[PDB]
Amino acid sequence: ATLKDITRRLKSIKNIQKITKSMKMVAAAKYARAERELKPARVYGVGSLALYEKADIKTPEDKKKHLIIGVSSDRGLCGAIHSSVAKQMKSEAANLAAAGKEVKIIGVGDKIRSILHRTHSDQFLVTFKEVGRRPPTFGDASVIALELLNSGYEFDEGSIIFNRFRSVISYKTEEKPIFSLDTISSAESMSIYDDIDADVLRNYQEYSLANIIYYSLKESTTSEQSARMTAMDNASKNASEMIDKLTLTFNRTRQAVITKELIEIISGAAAL
Amino acid sequence: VRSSAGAVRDAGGAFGKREQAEEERYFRARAKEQLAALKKHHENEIS
Amino acid sequence: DPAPATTFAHLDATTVLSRAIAELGIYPAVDPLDSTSRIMDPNIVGSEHYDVARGVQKILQDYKSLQDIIAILGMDELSEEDKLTVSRARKIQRFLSQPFQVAEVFTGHLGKLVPLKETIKGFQQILAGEYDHLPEQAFYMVGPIEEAVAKADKLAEEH
Amino acid sequence: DPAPATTFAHLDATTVLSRAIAELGIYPAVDPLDSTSRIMDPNIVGSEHYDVARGVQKILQDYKSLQDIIAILGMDELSEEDKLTVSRARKIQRFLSQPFQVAEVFTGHLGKLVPLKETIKGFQQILAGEYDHLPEQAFYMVGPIEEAVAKADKLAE
Amino acid sequence: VAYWRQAGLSYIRYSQICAKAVRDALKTEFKANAMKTSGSTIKIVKV
Amino acid sequence: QMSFTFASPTQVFFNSANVRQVDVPTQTGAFGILAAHVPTLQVLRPGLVVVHAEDGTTSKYFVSSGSVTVNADSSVQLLAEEAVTLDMLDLGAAKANLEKAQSELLGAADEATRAEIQIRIEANEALVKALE
Amino acid sequence: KQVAGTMKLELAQYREVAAFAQFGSDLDAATQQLLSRGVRLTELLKQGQYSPMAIEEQVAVIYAGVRGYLDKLEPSKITKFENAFLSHVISQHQALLGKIRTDGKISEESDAKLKEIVTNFLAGF
Incomplete structure (x- = not known):
C-alpha cells in the first residue's frame, strides 16, 4: 500500500x-445534565401518569379514530432510537390498522419523518420540528400540544412510544397510551371523581397529556443523549x-x- | 507525525465520500434556499 | 518527489496545482495554500491584498478541517459561524476558477480577463459575502464577481 | 508477487484463497471476489449461473464496501435496504459455505457437494430471501438449501 | 368555561399566559430561572 | 393520611407528604384538602399553597398555575406550573405590571387580546392579592 | 521564565482539550476559560516577518494575560489590542520598560506599574 x-x-x-x-x-455533558434534571422530572412524570393511572382507563372500543402519537428528534446519532422507535411504531401501526381506527401519525422530530418517509407517508398527522434543537422545554412541549389542540383530530385513543430510560444503559422503548375525554365520558370512576366539568375535564385531560408529553420527552431525550454517548x-x-x-x-x-x-x-x- | 485538517476528507475515503455526498445534500438544500430567495427578489423587483 | 525536491530547491516562484481540485472539477485547480509567491506580501501585495489572501488561506483551511468534521456529523450541527464559513468557502472555491477562450474549445465559456482591482474587490465582497442570498455556482468558472452576480441572475431566469 | 503476477496469464482458473475468509471461519476460505477465470459467461453459464454470479458479486461489493463504514459505524446508521442486504450477504457468505467430507474426517460434520442447478435454486431462494429469517449461522456450512431450512428449524429447536 | 374558554380560549393557552405572568413575577433571583425553561422551537409539518 | 405530591414542573413543594388539609386558588375552584374530597384534580389559579398540614405546619407557597390532583388515596398531586417562592417578586413590580395590564386592559384590543389582558388583570390581581 | 512557566502550562492545557473547541458549544467554564486563555494566545500566536521586538515587551504582554487583563479582549481584535498597549508602553512605560529590562528583576511595584500602564492602554483601547 x-x-x-x-x-x-x-x-x-x-x-x-x-x-x-x-x-x-459532549454527549456525556448532555446526558449528565439530562439525568440531573430528570430527578424532579421523574417525579413530575410519575405524577402525570398517575392521573389516568388513578382509574381503569377503558376508552371507547368503538374508536373509529386512533392516534399515532409519535415523537422523534431532529437530532440523531442515538442508535436504534429512531430505529426501535419505528419498530414499535410499525407494530402499533399494524395493530391499529387492524382496528381501522382513524389514527394519524402525530409528528415531532425529523427522524420519524424519515421513518414516515415511506411508512404510510400520508398518515402523518402533523410533524412538529426542531425536536431537540436545545434541551427539553415543557413550555415547548406545551407549544406542540397546543398545536395538537388546534388540530381537531378528535383522536378517541392514541399511544406514544417512549424509550423509558430504564437505566443509563436501559432505555425501555415503551409506548405511552392516551384516550379521549369523550371516551372518558361514561366512567363510574369518573362518577367516582369529584364534581368535574367535562370540557374542564377535557381541558385538564389535555393539560395532563401535555405534561405526559414533556415527561416522555425528557425521558427519551436522556435516553438519546446517553445512547449517543455510549454509541x-x-x-x-x-x-x-x-x-x-x-x-x-x-x-x-x-x-x-x-x-x-x-x-x-x-x-x-x-x-x- | 501530524493529523491534517480534514485529514480524513484529505484521504476522502468512504468517510470522505460521505463528506462529499453530505456536502451535496446540505449545500443543495441551501442552494434551493438561495435560489428561491432570488426568485422572490426577482418577483419583488418585477413591480 | 526527489525530482520535485530539486524543483522546489530553486523555484523562486511556486505554482502548486491541486489535481484533486481538478478532480473535483476545478478549472483552474491549483493547490491554494501550497504555492508560494513573493508578490503575495503586505510589503509587496500590499497589506490589504496579502492579508486578504492569507485570510482566504485560513478560511479554506477551515473548510477542509470542518469538511471532515461534517463527514462525521454534517451540516445538521452547522454552527452559525460554521455554516456561514461553509458557504463562504464553497463560494471562494467557486470564484477561484474560470473557463478560458482557448479552453472554451473544451470549457465552452470564453476567457474572462480578470482585473486585479476586480479580483481584490470580489475578494473583499466575498469577505462581506456578496452573494449570501445567491448561489455560489455562479462564481464557479467565472471572471469578475459582478459577472458572477449576473450569472446568478441568469440562473434566476433559468430556474 | 511478480512470480504469481506473471503466472496469472498461464492457466484457465485462478484460485485465490483468502485467509481473511478463514478468519470468517469460511470452510473453505476461497477468496470471494478474487479467484477468477474467463470461465464465467451466460453465453456458457446461461442466464441462471452467470446472472447469479454477477448479482452475488454486486451484493458482496456492497457488503465489503459497507464493512469499511461499519468498522466503527456498525449497523448504527445502516440503511434499511442496506442493512437488509448486508445481513443477507452475511448469510450468503454463510450459506454458500458447505462442509468437506475429507475435512469431516477431522471435522465430523459430513461434507458433500450439491448439484450446480441445486446451487442456483437455493441461491435464488436466498436472493429473494425464501429463508430470509434463517440465520447465517444456519446458513453457515450449508449444502442443500432445504437442509438449510432444516438447520433453521433445528435452530428454532 | 373561562373568560378565555367562554370566548373559547384554551385553558391550556390560559396556563400559557399564566406562565407568562409567573415569569413577569420572577424575582431578580428568579428572573433567570424563569428564562430558564423559556424556550421553544417545534414547528409543525406544512406543505 | 395524605399523599401530598406538591411540586413545580421544575421544583417540589410536597413529595407525596401526609398532611391534613391544604388549599390554594384554583381555576377549578379552590377548596380545602379533605380526606372525603373525592379522587379528583383541579385546574389551577394563582394561589398560595396553604396547607393545614397534619403537623403544625402552614407553609404558604405562592402558586401560579398548573393542576393539582388528589386520588382516593389522597394522592395530593399539586403539579405546579409556577409555585412562586415567598420572595418570588417585588410588590412594586406586581403593581407596575398591574398598571400595564390595566392600561392594555384599557387598551384591550379584542376579545382574544382583551381576554389576554383579562388574564393579565386577573393575574396581577392575584399578584396584588398575594402582596395583599 | 516566570512568564513562560504559566504560558506554556496554559498552552498545553488548551492543547489538552483543544479538540473539544471544535464543537465549542457547552464548553465547561473551566474548559471555556482555559480555551479563552488559549484563544487569547492564538490571537497572540501569530508573528510578523522581519519584525523582531523587545523580549521584555512579550514578557509584559504575557504578564498582562497572566493578570487575566486580556480576558475581555475579542481575540480577532485582541492582537491589535496588545499591539496598541505595546505602543502605549513603548511611549510612556518605556521608562518602566527599561526599568524592568535593566532590572531583570520583577519588582512587585514595577510589575504593578507596568500592569497599570497596560490597564490604561487596554481599557483605553
Missing part, C-alpha cells in the same frame, strides 16, 4: 478517534481496535518500504 495512502487512512483514523472522543465527552464509546473502542492493526501493518509497511528501497540500492550497488 502507498504509505502515502496508508498514512492518509491512518491520520484519518487518528482524527476520527479524537473527534469521537470529543463528541462522546460514541463503542465507536471509539472499534476505532482504537482498527487503529491497532492499522499501526501494526503501518510500521510493517514502513520498515518494509524502507528496507525495500534499501535492497534496491544494495542490488544497484551490486550492479556496479
Whole structure:
C-alpha cells in the first residue's frame, strides 16, 4: 500500500478517534445534565401518569379514530432510537390498522419523518420540528400540544412510544397510551371523581397529556443523549481496535518500504 | 507525525465520500434556499 | 518527489496545482495554500491584498478541517459561524476558477480577463459575502464577481 | 508477487484463497471476489449461473464496501435496504459455505457437494430471501438449501 | 368555561399566559430561572 | 393520611407528604384538602399553597398555575406550573405590571387580546392579592 | 521564565482539550476559560516577518494575560489590542520598560506599574 495512502487512512483514523472522543465527552455533558434534571422530572412524570393511572382507563372500543402519537428528534446519532422507535411504531401501526381506527401519525422530530418517509407517508398527522434543537422545554412541549389542540383530530385513543430510560444503559422503548375525554365520558370512576366539568375535564385531560408529553420527552431525550454517548464509546473502542492493526501493518509497511528501497540500492550497488 | 485538517476528507475515503455526498445534500438544500430567495427578489423587483 | 525536491530547491516562484481540485472539477485547480509567491506580501501585495489572501488561506483551511468534521456529523450541527464559513468557502472555491477562450474549445465559456482591482474587490465582497442570498455556482468558472452576480441572475431566469 | 503476477496469464482458473475468509471461519476460505477465470459467461453459464454470479458479486461489493463504514459505524446508521442486504450477504457468505467430507474426517460434520442447478435454486431462494429469517449461522456450512431450512428449524429447536 | 374558554380560549393557552405572568413575577433571583425553561422551537409539518 | 405530591414542573413543594388539609386558588375552584374530597384534580389559579398540614405546619407557597390532583388515596398531586417562592417578586413590580395590564386592559384590543389582558388583570390581581 | 512557566502550562492545557473547541458549544467554564486563555494566545500566536521586538515587551504582554487583563479582549481584535498597549508602553512605560529590562528583576511595584500602564492602554483601547 502507498504509505502515502496508508498514512492518509491512518491520520484519518487518528482524527476520527479524537473527534469521537470529543463528541462522546459532549454527549456525556448532555446526558449528565439530562439525568440531573430528570430527578424532579421523574417525579413530575410519575405524577402525570398517575392521573389516568388513578382509574381503569377503558376508552371507547368503538374508536373509529386512533392516534399515532409519535415523537422523534431532529437530532440523531442515538442508535436504534429512531430505529426501535419505528419498530414499535410499525407494530402499533399494524395493530391499529387492524382496528381501522382513524389514527394519524402525530409528528415531532425529523427522524420519524424519515421513518414516515415511506411508512404510510400520508398518515402523518402533523410533524412538529426542531425536536431537540436545545434541551427539553415543557413550555415547548406545551407549544406542540397546543398545536395538537388546534388540530381537531378528535383522536378517541392514541399511544406514544417512549424509550423509558430504564437505566443509563436501559432505555425501555415503551409506548405511552392516551384516550379521549369523550371516551372518558361514561366512567363510574369518573362518577367516582369529584364534581368535574367535562370540557374542564377535557381541558385538564389535555393539560395532563401535555405534561405526559414533556415527561416522555425528557425521558427519551436522556435516553438519546446517553445512547449517543455510549454509541460514541463503542465507536471509539472499534476505532482504537482498527487503529491497532492499522499501526501494526503501518510500521510493517514502513520498515518494509524502507528496507525495500534499501535492497534496491544494495542490488544497484551490486550492479556496479 | 501530524493529523491534517480534514485529514480524513484529505484521504476522502468512504468517510470522505460521505463528506462529499453530505456536502451535496446540505449545500443543495441551501442552494434551493438561495435560489428561491432570488426568485422572490426577482418577483419583488418585477413591480 | 526527489525530482520535485530539486524543483522546489530553486523555484523562486511556486505554482502548486491541486489535481484533486481538478478532480473535483476545478478549472483552474491549483493547490491554494501550497504555492508560494513573493508578490503575495503586505510589503509587496500590499497589506490589504496579502492579508486578504492569507485570510482566504485560513478560511479554506477551515473548510477542509470542518469538511471532515461534517463527514462525521454534517451540516445538521452547522454552527452559525460554521455554516456561514461553509458557504463562504464553497463560494471562494467557486470564484477561484474560470473557463478560458482557448479552453472554451473544451470549457465552452470564453476567457474572462480578470482585473486585479476586480479580483481584490470580489475578494473583499466575498469577505462581506456578496452573494449570501445567491448561489455560489455562479462564481464557479467565472471572471469578475459582478459577472458572477449576473450569472446568478441568469440562473434566476433559468430556474 | 511478480512470480504469481506473471503466472496469472498461464492457466484457465485462478484460485485465490483468502485467509481473511478463514478468519470468517469460511470452510473453505476461497477468496470471494478474487479467484477468477474467463470461465464465467451466460453465453456458457446461461442466464441462471452467470446472472447469479454477477448479482452475488454486486451484493458482496456492497457488503465489503459497507464493512469499511461499519468498522466503527456498525449497523448504527445502516440503511434499511442496506442493512437488509448486508445481513443477507452475511448469510450468503454463510450459506454458500458447505462442509468437506475429507475435512469431516477431522471435522465430523459430513461434507458433500450439491448439484450446480441445486446451487442456483437455493441461491435464488436466498436472493429473494425464501429463508430470509434463517440465520447465517444456519446458513453457515450449508449444502442443500432445504437442509438449510432444516438447520433453521433445528435452530428454532 | 373561562373568560378565555367562554370566548373559547384554551385553558391550556390560559396556563400559557399564566406562565407568562409567573415569569413577569420572577424575582431578580428568579428572573433567570424563569428564562430558564423559556424556550421553544417545534414547528409543525406544512406543505 | 395524605399523599401530598406538591411540586413545580421544575421544583417540589410536597413529595407525596401526609398532611391534613391544604388549599390554594384554583381555576377549578379552590377548596380545602379533605380526606372525603373525592379522587379528583383541579385546574389551577394563582394561589398560595396553604396547607393545614397534619403537623403544625402552614407553609404558604405562592402558586401560579398548573393542576393539582388528589386520588382516593389522597394522592395530593399539586403539579405546579409556577409555585412562586415567598420572595418570588417585588410588590412594586406586581403593581407596575398591574398598571400595564390595566392600561392594555384599557387598551384591550379584542376579545382574544382583551381576554389576554383579562388574564393579565386577573393575574396581577392575584399578584396584588398575594402582596395583599 | 516566570512568564513562560504559566504560558506554556496554559498552552498545553488548551492543547489538552483543544479538540473539544471544535464543537465549542457547552464548553465547561473551566474548559471555556482555559480555551479563552488559549484563544487569547492564538490571537497572540501569530508573528510578523522581519519584525523582531523587545523580549521584555512579550514578557509584559504575557504578564498582562497572566493578570487575566486580556480576558475581555475579542481575540480577532485582541492582537491589535496588545499591539496598541505595546505602543502605549513603548511611549510612556518605556521608562518602566527599561526599568524592568535593566532590572531583570520583577519588582512587585514595577510589575504593578507596568500592569497599570497596560490597564490604561487596554481599557483605553
